[PDB]
Structures are given as C-alpha cells and as structure tokens.
Swiss-Prot record:
The keyword Phosphoprotein applies. This is RISC-loading complex subunit TARBP2. The modification Phosphoserine is found at residue 10. Self-associates. Component of the RISC loading complex (RLC), or micro-RNA (miRNA) loading complex (miRLC), which is composed of DICER1, AGO2 and TARBP2. Note that the trimeric RLC/miRLC is also referred to as RISC. Interacts with EIF2AK2/PKR and inhibits its protein kinase activity. Interacts with DHX9 and PRKRA. Interacts with DICER1, AGO2, MOV10, EIF6 and RPL7A (60S ribosome subunit); they form a large RNA-induced silencing complex (RISC). Interacts with IRF7; this interaction prevents IRF7 phosphorylation and activation. Its main location: cytoplasm. Required for formation of the RNA induced silencing complex (RISC). Component of the RISC loading complex (RLC), also known as the micro-RNA (miRNA) loading complex (miRLC), which is composed of DICER1, AGO2 and TARBP2. Within the RLC/miRLC, DICER1 and TARBP2 are required to process precursor miRNAs (pre-miRNAs) to mature miRNAs and then load them onto AGO2. AGO2 bound to the mature miRNA constitutes the minimal RISC and may subsequently dissociate from DICER1 and TARBP2. May also play a role in the production of short interfering RNAs (siRNAs) from double-stranded RNA (dsRNA) by DICER1. It is found in: Cytoplasm; Cytoplasm, Perinuclear region; Nucleus. Residues 17-83 form the DRBM domain.
Length: 89
C-alpha cells in the first residue's frame, strides 16, 4: 500500500519567489520538478537577455530574463497562474 503525511512544520519566513512556489504546488498536484531550458537568446553585450521556457507535465510557459537564473523565475512565475486557473494577459 502507501501512506501520506506531511506533519506540523513551523512557517519558515522567507522572501517571496516563484521558483520556490512552483515546487510546493507541483507536489500538491502530483507532478515532478519543472524543466528549465533556453529556447531563444537575444540582446547586446552590455545587456544580454535569455529566453527560457518552462516545460511542465501538462503545461508550458515561455519566459525571458537578462540572465539565465532570472529567466527561470520569469517563466515559473507566469506558470503559477497558468496552472492555477485564471490567465491575465
């Protein structure tokens, strides 16, 4: 069989971020970690911009950010709503 239990854990006060949120939701939906891959790349040298897209089990959302680390978030954040329900855009 199988057993499920999280347990009472104190609320860890930490800055707000999508990358850290999508990780919590997924578990609730029963999905695996999101996939981060750079699709397109544009922008000059002084200001580089990478277009990263988030590939979810049954969801997808393209994002962009000056840097790779940022891009990931740009995509994740958007995904939050996408998977949530209402899509303002």
């Amino acid at each position: 069989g199988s057993s499920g239990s999280s347990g009472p854990v104190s609320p860890q006060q930490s800055e707000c971020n999508p990358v850290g949120a999508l990780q919590e939701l997924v578990v609730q939906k029963g999905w695996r970690l999101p996939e981060y891959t750079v699709t397109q790349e544009s922008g000059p040298a002084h200001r580089k911009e990478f277009t990263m897209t988030c590939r979810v089990e049954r969801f997808i959302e393209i994002g962009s950010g000056t840097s790779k680390k940022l891009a990931k978030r740009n995509a994740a954040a958007k995904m939050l709503l996408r998977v949530s329900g209402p899509s303002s855009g």
